[PDB]
Design a protein around this ligand. Sequence first.
Ligand code: HEC
Ligand code: MSS
Lengths: 81, 373
Amino acid sequence: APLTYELPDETAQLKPAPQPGFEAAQNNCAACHSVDYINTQPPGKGQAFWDAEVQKMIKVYHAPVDEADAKAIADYLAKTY
Amino acid sequence: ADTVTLPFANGERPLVMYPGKRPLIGLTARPPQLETPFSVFDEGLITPNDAFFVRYHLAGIPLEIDPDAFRLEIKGKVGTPLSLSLQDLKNDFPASEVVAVNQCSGNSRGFVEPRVGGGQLANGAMGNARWRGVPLKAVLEKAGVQAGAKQVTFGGLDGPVIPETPDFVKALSIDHATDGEVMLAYSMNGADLPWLNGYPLRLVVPGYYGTYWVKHLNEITVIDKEFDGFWMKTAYRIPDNACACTEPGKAPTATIPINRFDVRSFITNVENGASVKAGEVPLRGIAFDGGYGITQVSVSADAGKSWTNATLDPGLGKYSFRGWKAVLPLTKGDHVLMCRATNARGETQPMQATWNPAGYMRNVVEATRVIAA
Ligand code: HEC
Ligand code: MSS
């Protein structure tokens, strides 16, 4: 038989917020990787940092995220992280 | 219980348990990025398989592999394309062994100031192992490299979740690939490769940052041009200057692929705020570089005002961690300990940290405050 490997259960979650970007990020930013990528970035980086992360995901990695959601998500991240 | 805090902002991390591994520092789960607790580096010059750090880029890592069916394909600008089994590699080519450090390009990124995006690592994305396998030179010679070859590309079993995301493929110069040190490794510390360290085969590229050390390696292509894949063309770029550095907040005007390690050293038997007995205090640690040889390690107990020569431990090879020991007289009170290595071509460590946008290649002189009583 082949050999196999078992990963532990994934538990990483985004920080809740009332901004609509929270839900948008839940629905878009876990599709390729766990959200611990986001949770562990340097803190209080601000708007330009998070705008650039979101744009990179869309333009470089081809994340299928529309313009309104891209703004909502970046705004949520900059306010929350 | 189950978390640690690394010594920089937003440093909390879960301690996580993977099959065949001891508890490690969980950076990401999908795909796995796992960092080694610093305490491990004081436990011996060779990093145990169960402690060895893990880094991947794409979530689609293999989780079922039939080692009998596995084939390494050698193709492109070669006279005879090859499809090699693990049994072929083990039996048809004499084996080589090398003790070599693997270190992530962004090891220590969390300490970079101003902070930069990416993997927020402390110093535990490095490890030293005894690798055994076949020199790439021997396999390429069997295939027959054609005149005009320029580079060799390397790809593995992992892939992206969505196919538009660029596949993880790296390249070496043909002259590097055929140098006899670059290795197709099927064994790590006397065992088959741990799963997350690239079972059943990986590229080992001694003295080069870890991005080149392609895991689950199944495709080697000899090409007559520079490879323009994303992970060579766009990712893993450093400033094209001696310091591989820019003014904080400024982008480089020119870049090249990341390449050889810079010189690093650490004191492993004490950490910030540790207690030591005033008097003669034994210190020990490690140093390493791109494979030129560590010439000396100097140690200070007064924040770099004066230095004492450490005694280097017997070596395990030019690509290994080099152990060192020093016994320093410490008066009662606080002391800022530092260690600083140099290599056989005069490379050393800066006293003040430099910066680049990706937070690669950190090698500043490490300082550790201790309390002598
Ligand atoms: C697949 C198309 C992706 C989607 C959907 C999102 N991201 Fe992503 N991200 C992707 C890749 C291939 C990587 C590199 C992984 C590696 O290990 O190198 C990342 C990485 C990040 C990071 C880390 C910082 C960085 O490398 O830029 C962050 C903070 C991040 N991703 C955030 C993020 C957000 C906010 C997303 C929704 C807009 C998102 N990712 C989606 C690929 C993909
Ligand atoms: N296949 C593959 N391989 C691979 C990858 C991926 O992702 N994939 N990554 C890299 C990196 S990036 Mo940075 O530069 S470091 C690194 C390394 C690590 O290893 P380990 O995991 O074994 O430790 O690997 C290498 N290899």
